[PDB]
Point group: C4
Chain length 271, copies 4
């Protein structure tokens, strides 16, 4: 069909992307103005209608995309499903979920990420970098769980606001890890009752700050190489060898070329 | 002309650079002494005249440079325009701009950076490294904007000093990100009214600290390679291949040399 | 023997690993529920019996492993000795050691690390990375010891809570290093009595934060390469050349191939 | 001479190094015990004599080294001059310097670094890494000086404890940079009088934390490669090409080998 063809040409254009980006910024700005409690009844009603206009433009946009690519074709992309959910969640007459309320209309600004390709690639790098740090994130989870059970048993009876239960302990252990008032606010007061409390919190700080930094460095380094390798694949179209694989087999590739040079020289000297 | 030639020879000399560097340090030191409110009327007038002398030396310096290189030639360098603005801004009888006042004469010490070539190269590395982190900086901007709108709507009515409006929220979210009294000062008090506030601030901390570190690591790594590659171009004069490009095509260059070795060996065995 | 053979086949299976992992999570969860002081007598007795069941399953598991591999074969692995100690420590009718009490049954959750191979490899990377940072860790130890002796002599008489003895000084120096209330809580108050105290604490902060970061970066970078090289050895089975050795001899390997190319070209031109 | 020869053989032995290391630890431990104000007159006199014994052993050690290597030969090493000063400074009957007092006998423990070769190499890596970060350290110095002059002029009259003079401003700007109570303790109070103070402190934090991290990453990366390259030179004895030089010329070395392969193949096909 010619109708689905020219609609895709329109959707894939730079101006269409710019119009949709402009509407996201406009929706974002109206939601920001609506945080102002002093605004008049007319000013609020006006901005709410501008929010309604922005929302309807997105319904036209998504419906135009579903028709032009097909239900299966549109939903083949994770970015499209995200775009679909962000907009479709607004058209909901009552929902039965384990969430508070959908008053967070501002999450629509997250579409700037999906609509801008350079920003889409950054998040892509970060998400693809997550599986590779799963074991470190799990190790940190185990350290926190063990630590929380210990802290609850040791300090909960004497310090109930900070360690009274497992939930309170997880919260103040996260605070200790971020180094936030860990000594003047938590451990110096706890040491006044339990003088050897530093045997618990100092190794806890040393271990968690090292593991967290490991988790962050792991993500930053992979995400940086993934984003870079994706660009070399979104230019040449050829598959890019992962930098780690190049580095692992570098020595192997060097001795093979060395040995092939000597045997070629061995046959060259005697002809 | 012989006048413009010998003036360039003088300007490009090591001693001329040292004289101008000495005057910048002297101007910087007099402005530092002038922060002392206890000083006598004579001492203040004296230092203000030494500041005036330093300023006039810079007017001679820039005018000497404009004549020796030509208006177009001088203004071709961004460092020269910066040097021009820093000095020309002082000779201003009233200005109509969206700024407070030009009492910040101390910004003249920033000329140490433009006048010292090693320091000029460091800032150059840092500035050239900025475009490459634009998408991460934009992602962090979007996270802050979404977060500020949420925090204003959720906590502004109960916590007006910290979240009363969009501006107050952006400020305390920047504080939370820097881990400054985030729990003892902000979130433990907010949890006394909103017990699930940690569902907001803990993921906000996790996401922003990771993104900020990504932004900083990105800048530090590029700036380091740019400064290094600039030096290999300011020695040999030959263009230096970016380290990333060397790394991306390393595997490709290795299999090409491997394949050329085997085909050469294939023709060598049968002659 | 056929009995020891089929028992090893069972132990090395994926389902056996999953059953033992399930029991660790179950034991971990019951120990977490037991931190709740409000629980009834029946609820506590019940969970204590579920803890007892979990413990006995581990005694069956280890005994099954000792028989199937032999005492020497089982104890050949450091992970097995760790698994043995974690379980065998529970079956102890009074012990004479320089420890408080074995109420930390929650340390049994650390078995998730030894039982899950990806998690076992992460800790392995981290432990093997420790010898290489021993000199930096020793340098930081020497800085802390010298600093503590100084701080005790200088500030102990005027500030006994923070510097009264060597132990109190080591503790507040660790706090200063983590940047926790170092100025508003410790150094601004100390400067009210000793105005040049900043000559001590600012260089102490500068030196220790740099050394700690060196210690952490050192561990993170090695552990990352060790874990990666271990995987290339737990796939191909061939020994992986350490990335540092590849990098050190890279220039050497390149000039050797360059020189062999020119001499081959020298003999090729004249035949 | 045979006397100077066998004395060098003794000095260069492992046991001699161990004896001197034992005496440093012993001296360090006695100085630590002497921080205890509760000690009796006899206990103090005893430890002071053990300190005196340790000091005399070092005088024998250095004098033995000066004779065995010669005045010029001994003083040729920077580590020896350091060892000489640390010991010779103790034998001083009154000194006229811009220092407080030589009560810091504990600085003798810094000899553990010079006496242990692995620890000596770590400090060597760190010291040799300093010239390369001189421009970044200078940039950070200029930012602090400009910032201190601004802060004194803007906030000194309203906030004299924190910004009353140039010295007070440098101190609280260093505190702000370390993120220590920067908002709850300094900027929220300053904003109550100067509402746009965040325009000053937020860009100051952003710029200084980035520059400091640049300074630290710069030192850690060079020191790590220097220590590594020094070891490859203290094993093979051959000069090690700096990793940066290997990386810069990697692309250049690859295209030269590529071009030499094609021209060799061009002559091989037609013989
Ligand atoms: C720190 C980055 C790094 C890595 C590397 C080391 C040896 C190789 O053969 C290939 C890659 C590296 C890079 C990324 C890694 O994973 C990131 C997320 N997993 C934690 C793991 C290792 C490295 C380490 C030392 C020298 C050169 C590169
Ligand atoms: C962390 C530096 C790094 C990089 C790299 C990875 C693969 C390549 O083919 C070329 C460069 C790298 C270096 C700088 C980068 O950009 C810095 C600013 N953008 C966020 C992005 C990636 C890297 C990652 C893993 C192993 C070796 C180098
Ligand atoms: C930061 C990692 C690194 C390293 C390197 C530098 C030169 C070499 O010939 C081989 C390895 C490196 C990697 C890990 C090191 O040890 C980690 C634990 N010891 C402190 C030490 C150095 C490096 C530094 C500069 C460029 C490329 C890699
Ligand atoms: C971060 C280390 C690094 C570096 C590098 C980049 C390109 C080269 O041709 C040679 C070395 C590097 C390593 C150390 C440097 O100096 C450390 C102290 N000066 C600030 C500067 C740059 C680098 C950056 C990107 C990819 C691979 C290595
Ligand atoms: C090259 C991109 C990449 C990886 C990479 C990124 C930066 C580096 O400096 C080195 C390796 C990568 C990241 C993590 C990996 O394993 C982590 C261990 N698994 C638990 C394996 C490969 C990768 C490869 C396949 C899938 C996802 C990421
Ligand atoms: C080699 C200098 C360089 C870059 C570089 C610096 C250090 C590395 O370890 C790897 C790459 C660089 C930096 C960032 C780049 O892309 C970031 C993604 N764009 C949003 C691409 C290249 C660069 C190249 C062209 C223009 C500006 C910087
Ligand atoms: C390759 C794994 C490895 C090392 C390594 C990891 C990551 C890198 O980027 C560069 C080197 C390593 C780590 C530390 C080493 O020496 C530190 C100085 N000794 C005090 C020597 C080698 C190693 C080698 C042998 C035993 C243990 C670790
Ligand atoms: C290889 C050791 C080295 C350097 C190095 C260390 C680690 C790397 O990843 C890349 C380079 C080094 C460090 C800093 C350099 O320049 C910084 C800019 N000068 C202001 C130049 C070279 C060096 C070289 C000569 C003297 C001192 C240090
Ligand atoms: C750098 C490595 C960390 C140094 C280790 C710190 C030593 C802890 C010793 C210590 O401070 N206490 C003495 C235990 O008897 C416990 C506390 O009671 C004490 O700090 C009081 O101030 C409260
Ligand atoms: C490491 C991952 C972070 C751990 C997650 C923390 C759990 C938060 C649970 C919790 O603390 N609350 C119970 C919610 O019912 C909310 C607060 O009310 C409570 O902290 C009070 O102390 C105030
Ligand atoms: C960035 C590099 C660090 C800057 C260095 C800070 C200068 C310290 C000078 C100074 O503040 N004092 C004056 C010494 O005479 C000591 C204190 O007494 C003073 O701070 C009072 O506020 C208390
Ligand atoms: C993440 C980027 C940083 C966000 C920028 C923060 C906006 C600052 C706006 C603001 O807070 N003020 C309004 C200026 O009119 C100044 C202060 O007066 C105010 O914070 C009061 O709470 C005191
Ligand atoms: Na901090
Ligand atoms: Na704090
Ligand atoms: Na803090």
């Amino acid at each position: 069909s010619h109708m689905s063809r020219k609609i895709r040409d329109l959707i894939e254009s730079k101006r269409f992307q710019n119009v949709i980006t402009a509407i996201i910024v406009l929706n974002g700005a109206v939601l920001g103005l609506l945080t102002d409690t002093t605004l008049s009844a007319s000013s609020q009603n006006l901005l709410e209608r501008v929010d309604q206009l922005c929302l309807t433009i997105f319904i036209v946009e998504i419906s135009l995309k579903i028709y032009a690519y097909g239900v299966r074709g549109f939903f083949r992309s994770g970015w499209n499903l995200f775009d679909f959910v962000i907009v479709a969640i607004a058209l909901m007459p009552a929902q039965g979920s384990l969430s508070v309320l959908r008053t967070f209309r501002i999450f629509r600004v997250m579409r700037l990420v999906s609509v801008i390709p350079t920003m889409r690639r950054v998040v892509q790098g970060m998400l693809l970098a997550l599986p590779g740090v799963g074991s470190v994130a799990a190790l940190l989870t185990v350290v926190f769980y063990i630590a929380a059970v210990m802290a609850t048993n040791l300090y909960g009876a004497t310090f109930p606001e900070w360690f009274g239960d497992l939930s309170k302990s997880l919260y103040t252990l996260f605070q200790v890890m971020t180094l936030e008032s860990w000594s003047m606010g938590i451990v110096r007061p706890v040491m006044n009752v339990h003088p050897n409390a530093w045997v618990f919190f100092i190794p806890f700080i040393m271990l968690t700050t090292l593991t967290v930094l490991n988790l962050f460095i792991g993500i930053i380094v992979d995400a940086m190489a993934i984003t870079k390798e994706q660009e070399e694949e979104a230019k040449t179209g050829h598959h890019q060898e992962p930098i780690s694989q190049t580095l692992l087999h570098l020595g192997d590739r060097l001795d093979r070329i060395e040995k092939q040079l000597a045997q070629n020289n061995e046959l060259l000297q005697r002809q």
